[PDB]
Amino acid sequence: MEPEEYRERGREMVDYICQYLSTVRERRVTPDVQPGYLRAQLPESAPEDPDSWDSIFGDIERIIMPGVVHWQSPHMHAYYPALTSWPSLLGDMLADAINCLGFTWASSPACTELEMNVMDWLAKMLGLPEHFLHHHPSSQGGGVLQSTVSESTLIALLAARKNKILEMKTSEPDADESSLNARLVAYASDQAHSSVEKAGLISLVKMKFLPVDDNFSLRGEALQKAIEEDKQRGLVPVFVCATLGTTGVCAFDCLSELGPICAREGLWLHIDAAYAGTAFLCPEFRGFLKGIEYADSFTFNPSKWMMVHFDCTGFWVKDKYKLQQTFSVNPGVATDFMHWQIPLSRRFRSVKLWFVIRSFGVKNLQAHVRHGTEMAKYFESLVRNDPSFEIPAKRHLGLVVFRLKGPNSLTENVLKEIAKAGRLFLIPATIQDKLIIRFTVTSQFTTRDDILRDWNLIRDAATLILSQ
Amino acid sequence: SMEPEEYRERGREMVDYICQYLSTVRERRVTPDVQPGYLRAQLPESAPEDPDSWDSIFGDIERIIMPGVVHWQSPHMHAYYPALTSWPSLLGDMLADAINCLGFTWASSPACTELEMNVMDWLAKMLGLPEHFLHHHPSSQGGGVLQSTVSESTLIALLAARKNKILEMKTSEPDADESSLNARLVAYASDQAHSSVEKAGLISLVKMKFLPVDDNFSLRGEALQKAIEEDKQRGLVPVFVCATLGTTGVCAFDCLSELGPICAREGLWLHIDAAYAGTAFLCPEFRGFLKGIEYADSFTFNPSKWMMVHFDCTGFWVKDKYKLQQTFSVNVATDFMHWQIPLSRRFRSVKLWFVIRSFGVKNLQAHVRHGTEMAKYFESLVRNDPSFEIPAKRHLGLVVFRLKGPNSLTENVLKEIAKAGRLFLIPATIQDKLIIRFTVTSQFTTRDDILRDWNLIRDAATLILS
Ligand SMILES: *Cc1c(COP(=O)(O)O)cnc(C)c1O
Numbered sequence: 002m003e004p005e006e007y008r009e010r011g012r013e014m015v016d017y018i019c020q021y022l023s024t025v026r027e028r029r030v031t032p033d034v035q036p037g038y039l040r041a042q043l044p045e046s047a048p049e050d051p052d053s054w055d056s057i058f059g060d061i062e063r064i065i066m067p068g069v070v071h072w073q074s075p076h077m078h079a080y081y082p083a084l085t086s087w088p089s090l091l092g093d094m095l096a097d098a099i100n101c102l103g104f105t106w107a108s109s110p111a112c113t114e115l116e117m118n119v120m121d122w123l124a125k126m127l128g129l130p131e132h133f134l135h136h137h138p139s140s141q142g143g144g145v146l147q148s149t150v151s152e153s154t155l156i157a158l159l160a161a162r163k164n165k166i167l168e169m170k171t172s173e174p175d176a177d178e179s180s181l182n183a184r185l186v187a188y189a190s191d192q193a194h195s196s197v198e199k200a201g202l203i204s205l206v207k208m209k210f211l212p213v214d215d216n217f218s219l220r221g222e223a224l225q226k227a228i229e230e231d232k233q234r235g236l237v238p239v240f241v242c243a244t245l246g247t248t249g250v251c252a253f254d255c256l257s258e259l260g261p262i263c264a265r266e267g268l269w270l271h272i273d274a275a276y277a278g279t280a281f282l283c284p285e286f287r288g289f290l291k292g293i294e295y296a297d298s299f300t301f302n303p304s305k306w307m308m309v310h311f312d313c314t315g316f317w318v319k320d321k322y323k324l325q326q327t328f329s330v331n332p333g334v335a336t337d338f339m340h341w342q343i344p345l346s347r348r349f350r351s352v353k354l355w356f357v358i359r360s361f362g363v364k365n366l367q368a369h370v371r372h373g374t375e376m377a378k379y380f381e382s383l384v385r386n387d388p389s390f391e392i393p394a395k396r397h398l399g400l401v402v403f404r405l406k407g408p409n410s411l412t413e414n415v416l417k418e419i420a421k422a423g424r425l426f427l428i429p430a431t432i433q434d435k436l437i438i439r440f441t442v443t444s445q446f447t448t449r450d451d452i453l454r455d456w457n458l459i460r461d462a463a464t465l466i467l468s469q
Numbered sequence: 470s471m472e473p474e475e476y477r478e479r480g481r482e483m484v485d486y487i488c489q490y491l492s493t494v495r496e497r498r499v500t501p502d503v504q505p506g507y508l509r510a511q512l513p514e515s516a517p518e519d520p521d522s523w524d525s526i527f528g529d530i531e532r533i534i535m536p537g538v539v540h541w542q543s544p545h546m547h548a549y550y551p552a553l554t555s556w557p558s559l560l561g562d563m564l565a566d567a568i569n570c571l572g573f574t575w576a577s578s579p580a581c582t583e584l585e586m587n588v589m590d591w592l593a594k595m596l597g598l599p600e601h602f603l604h605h606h607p608s609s610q611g612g613g614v615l616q617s618t619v620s621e622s623t624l625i626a627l628l629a630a631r632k633n634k635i636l637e638m639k640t641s642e643p644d645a646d647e648s649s650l651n652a653r654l655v656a657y658a659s660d661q662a663h664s665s666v667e668k669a670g671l672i673s674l675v676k677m678k679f680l681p682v683d684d685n686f687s688l689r690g691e692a693l694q695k696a697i698e699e700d701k702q703r704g705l706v707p708v709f710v711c712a713t714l715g716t717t718g719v720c721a722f723d724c725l726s727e728l729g730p731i732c733a734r735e736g737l738w739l740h741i742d743a744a745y746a747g748t749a750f751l752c753p754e755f756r757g758f759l760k761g762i763e764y765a766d767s768f769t770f771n772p773s774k775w776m777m778v779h780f781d782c783t784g785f786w787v788k789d790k791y792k793l794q795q796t797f798s799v800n801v802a803t804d805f806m807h808w809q810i811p812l813s814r815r816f817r818s819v820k821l822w823f824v825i826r827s828f829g830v831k832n833l834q835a836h837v838r839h840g841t842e843m844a845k846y847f848e849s850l851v852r853n854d855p856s857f858e859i860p861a862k863r864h865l866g867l868v869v870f871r872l873k874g875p876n877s878l879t880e881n882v883l884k885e886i887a888k889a890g891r892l893f894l895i896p897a898t899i900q901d902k903l904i905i906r907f908t909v910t911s912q913f914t915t916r917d918d919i920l921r922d923w924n925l926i927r928d929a930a931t932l933i934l935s
């Protein structure tokens with residue numbers, strides 16, 4: 002492609018993007034396609050000669066879009082949000098042209114140096130302890146960007162089990178690290194995201210999921226019981242994942258109770274706040290963040306609610322030496338992030354994060370969180386006024402869970418019917434034995450009209466199923 | 470809060486900037502003259518409470534960011550291996566970042582999965598990989614998935630290998646803790662292997678043994694067989710081999726025709742690290758290094774290095790997708806969350822699709838052949854100067870050389886070059902010898918860029934040798 006033929010085609014892509022994101026409401030959020038739909042539409046081999054750019058651009062709507070789930074539609078309500086924004090897009094265009102790798106400070110200093118400063122910005126913005134900042138006198142920890150909360154949670158466990166094994170060796174210097182690993186046990190809520198179980202599966206660390214209270218919150222008494230029972234069998238408690246904003250119903254583990262136990266029992270305390278983390282930009286939601294000073298590590302996704310496009314996960318550790326001894330065999334003033342992560346290579350993610358924090362500024366990020374929560378409150382009040390439906394868990398943020406009164410099958414068929422037109426996107430979840438509809442406020446541009454429109458389609462589907 | 474007509478103008482602004490930057494990159498000091506700590510002083514202490522201007526933000530690119538940048542897109546970048554961008558790759562990711570769909574399951578965005586599957590079948594064919602690596606070959610149990618790095622792809626391969634062997638050892642030891650069984654395992658690579666292999670061992674608590682190489686720095690069948698027998702005798706269970714095609718140091722090739730049959734016979738997961746060299750397998754004449762590929766359980770390369778797709782974009786192929794999914798799940802649509810460490814993944818296949826379509830196989834092949842020709846030319850210039858030796862053969866785009874005599878001569882040549890930073894070079898070591906690695910990077914590298922860079926190097930040598 003000629004620098005001439007990149008200017009025009011670059012321009013045509015900025016126009017398309019501006020059109021696509023502005024008119025996203027006009028899209029069927031769910032694509033009407035079956036598995037394998039794409040193969041017969043694509044040649045069986047890569048083209049030998051250049052395909053014309055017109056043909057490639059023409060294929061965006063002709064073959065790509067019909068298979069897309071439109072995650073930027075206000076009628077997307079499944080999972081948790083993944084929000085893009087105009088600034089985020091502008092940052093990555095820059096980063097991807099540079100295309101530098103920041104494994105060491107030396108490999109591209111700016112890649113490392115912007116990230117350290119912007120991560121300090123973001124720790125402040127969320128009200129995290131000062132011991133999670135790079136540039137604080139007493140602090141010996143810091144923030145690093147990761148691709149997902151999933152890997153962040155794995156890294157915390159990896160750092161946790163490594164530090165404990167090194168400690169266990171000083172008694173048994175002839176024992177094999179893997180053999181010592183056998184004795185370890187890690188805990189989370191039974192509401193924990195599947196990333197916790199997968200971290201266990203990958204690390205070969207025994208994982209035990211602890212029962213929750215009526216608000217689906219893990220309590221200090223559940224952890225304290227488990228610790229005593231496991232130690233009784235000669236198991237070695239090593240790790241606790243506390244979830245601030247569970248996937249299912251957006252419950253909050255009681256951190257003020259879990260934090261002090263982990264500090265007393267010397268257990269690595271990891272905070273998974275993937276979604277709810279963005280809410281901590283607002284001091285009025287920071288209630289759930291009480292006992293944070295006990296956290297050994299904390300993670301949240303700007304890539305869920307804070308309007309940074311994926312990938313962009315914040316990961317803070319208290320002790321950057323324990324993190325780096327996980328990844329280095331060999332334990333100067335320059336920070337090398339390749340020792341803070343699984344891979345070697347990393348890219349210049351910090352630009353897009355920087356542009357978003359700057360382009361919006363703090364108060365507008367805090368107002369986005371409040372407006373999204375407001376739209377969830379409006380949706381809640383609609384559900385709660387209709388006695389066909391029940392809400393089995395409290396709405397703290399932008400997620401409302403509900404179901405038809407009666408058997409699971411009614412709620413199942415409601416989802417099935419909503420799915421036929423796919424004018425809003427919903428995913429069947431479960432708490433205990435009860436099937437629920439999760440309704441997540443996503444788009445920053447969500448209106449009260451969007452919410453009522455979506456509620457009416459749910460009501461229409463409920464009315465049709467309850468008439469069979 | 471921005472607005473559509475505001476975004477429109479700044480996109481046009483960012484487009485022109487990037488055309489200028491990539492177009493003029495030769496004019497940049499390749500490495501920056503900066504000290505660690507340098508950037509904090511020029512940033513506020515805290516995030517701005519209200520929106521900053523876009524002339525302010527766009528200004529800070531040349532003002533605050535580009536000073537601290539190593540220009541990886543410079544023809545005068547010759548350190549590590551290439552990480553090549555191109556206009557089609559940038560345009561593909563523009564679209565992907567706008568859609569911002571996650572593809573953890575087929576359902577979460579069908580296109581994100583199906584475009585990846587078909588383009589990964591495209592790429593297997595282009596590299597001349599076995600058909601048992603294709604999603605859509607009728608007799609395949611395997612397929613390709615995009616990952617972020619070769620590093621993580623190698624970790625995954627080792628995790629999949631150790632999990633499969635532990636599940637098997639369980640059959641005759643039902644009471645054995647998985648972690649206890651893992652203690653018996655041993656994995657192998659070349660002592661020329663990328664640090665990612667050592668790192669995968671440290672993460673997984675799997676014993677890693679690095680094996681000696683021949684005079685071409687190639688790992689040979691005899692060394693692996695000898696290791697396996699000595700380790701089996703001591704109660705260790707061989708589980709994994711990483712065979713490297715294009716080593717970091719000198720771009721050597723492990724003897725895959727020997728290693729393959731030993732791995733199949735002895736029950737070792739055979740993982741191929743072709744991070745850099747992989748892109749060469751686009752050209753049939755380099756597929757000699759691929760001999761024995763049929764024995765491989767997994768294969769990984771970085772389009773992200775030499776194929777002009779910007780980072781991140783690593784291809785990872787497995788023969789048995791079920792052994793992969795058993796690694797990642799405690800217990801028709803393909804769900805890529807079971808082929809990787811994390812749950813979430815983004816629409817990386819758009820930039821790959823765009824690159825492969827915008828160039829065609831022919832132009833990508835001409836790109837590889839041209840980088841190789843420029844390396845061959847540089848080689849001829851070094852070989853003609855008897856002050857210099859070439860202690861390992863040049864198969865692709867990397868030439869390694871040094872001054873004859875002690876390492877200080879070569880060290881002082883590198884120190885002399887690094888004063889003006891006009892070309893970025895990183896030293897390696899093969900045994901008792903400091904070497905200069907000279908990697909042909911940019912797809913726009915000409916003979917003049919090579920001769921320019923050679924002349925700086927020979928000048929540095931003339932100076933140091935008197
Ligand atoms: C979404 C989510 C995660 C993991 O998301 P990633 O794709 O791994 O970044 C983890 N925990 C909770 C509570 C989540 O909602």
Ligand SMILES: *Cc1c(COP(=O)(O)O)cnc(C)c1O
Pocket residue numbers: 344345346550617618619620621663665713714715716717742743744745771783
């Ligand atoms: C560059 C390189 C790697 C590392 O690649 P990442 O994608 O950064 O992990 C691994 N192996 C070899 C042979 C390499 O040349």
